[PDB]
Write a structure and sequence with these properties.
Length: 283
């Protein structure tokens, strides 16, 4: 039988230190192709090792298609091929769009759903998985208004995370590194920051906040580890809740939820399953 492997690379939709992401075509269908820099080969290996362990399949997890290693004269080429989401990342989307109540809730509940699927062990099934780099650039927007979580290159099963989104116990190095629940609680902190980024873009009473990343007002671009530690650990700052949120029942409820993702004590934070339940009772 014929095995048609050729993928046509059509346009670059992302370039970074990690490498590049391309819109590609396979048998008439869009795929996304991540081409890894040699500097970040371990991210390809870890994501491949995870998918070789458990073939994750969930509407709110970026859909795996293939992992390819190709021999070159002087190098190894590493590609990850996934489903293609033409609307791009949540980070991108929130810059050019405001949200109504239904669309805000649908976004955040879909992220909570993907995250709970990663976190929870299924027996007989899947190991529990922590993401370790959850942020709005690692979430894609689907045409049906739900999102999916991308990039399992740091994931752990039961490179460091983006500093802006690191929990206090990562910044002060008190994290219990031998305890898998520690890693879930780091993801919950980051989830709360994403919930804040999204909630800002939800209109109420004709008001909306401009898109800003978490801590935009207290750290520089590309904040250092020390910049983040001083804000999050020493001063114990948290993102601002605008007064206008307290005129809107949805944003009032979301503010409470994000507060319960940001406790200094990791074991006080809500679980992904509890976040899902709370979001199903909002509106
Ligand atoms: C090697 O490389 C790539 C391969 C493919 C690809 C292309 N056609 C057909 C296939 C195929 C799938 C599954 C079976 C099964 C059939 C049932 N039987 C009991 C076991 C075997 C056979 C063939 C594949 C996997 C795509 C690629 O890119 C999208 C590849 O490159 C990464
Ligand atoms: C990698 O990705 C894609 C792969 C394919 C594809 C191509 N040839 C053959 C297959 C296949 C056939 C049959 C089985 C068997 C398995 C056991 N038992 C005997 C019942 C069923 C498995 C696999 C597939 C899945 C199509 C895709 O898209 C249309 C892919 O997505 C981009
Ligand atoms: C975060 O991580 C990964 C993401 C993806 C991925 C999947 N679908 C779509 C995208 C995308 C498409 C298009 C735009 C822009 C460009 C055109 N226009 C001006 C606005 C829209 C942005 C983003 C990406 C980047 C794939 C990955 O691996 C293959 C990723 O790594 C795991």
């Amino acid at each position: 039988r014929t095995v048609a492997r050729d993928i046509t690379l059509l346009e670059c939709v992302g370039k970074g230190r990690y490498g590049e992401v391309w819109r590609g075509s396979w048998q008439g269908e869009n795929v996304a192709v991540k081409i890894f820099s040699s500097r970040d080969e371990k991210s390809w290996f870890r994501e491949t090792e995870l998918y070789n362990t458990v073939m994750l399949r969930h509407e709110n997890i970026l859909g795996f298609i293939a992992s390819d290693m190709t021999s070159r004269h002087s190098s190894t080429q590493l590609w990850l091929i996934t489903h293609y989401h033409e609307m791009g990342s949540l980070y991108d989307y929130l810059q050019l769009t405001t949200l109504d109540t239904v669309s805000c809730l649908r976004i955040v509940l879909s992220i909570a759903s993907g995250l709970a699927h990663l976190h929870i062990e299924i027996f007989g099934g899947k190991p529990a998985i922590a993401h370790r780099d959850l942020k709005s650039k690692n979430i894609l927007v689907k045409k049906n208004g739900q999102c999916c979580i991308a990039d399992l290159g740091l994931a752990v099963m039961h490179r460091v995370g983006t500093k802006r989104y690191m929990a206090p116990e990562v910044l002060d190095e008190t994290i219990q590194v031998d305890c898998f629940d520690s890693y879930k609680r780091v993801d919950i902190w980051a989830f709360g920051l994403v919930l804040w980024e999204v909630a800002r873009r939800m209109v109420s009473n004709g008001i909306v906040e401009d898109y800003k990343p978490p801590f935009y007002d207290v750290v520089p671009n590309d904040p250092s580890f020390e910049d983040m530690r001083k804000v999050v650990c020493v001063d114990q700052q948290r993102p601002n809740i605008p007064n206008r949120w307290f005129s809107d029942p949805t944003l009032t409820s979301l503010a409470k939820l994000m507060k319960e993702c940001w406790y200094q004590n990791p074991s006080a934070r809500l679980t992904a399953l509890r976040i899902k339940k709370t979001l199903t009772k909002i509106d």
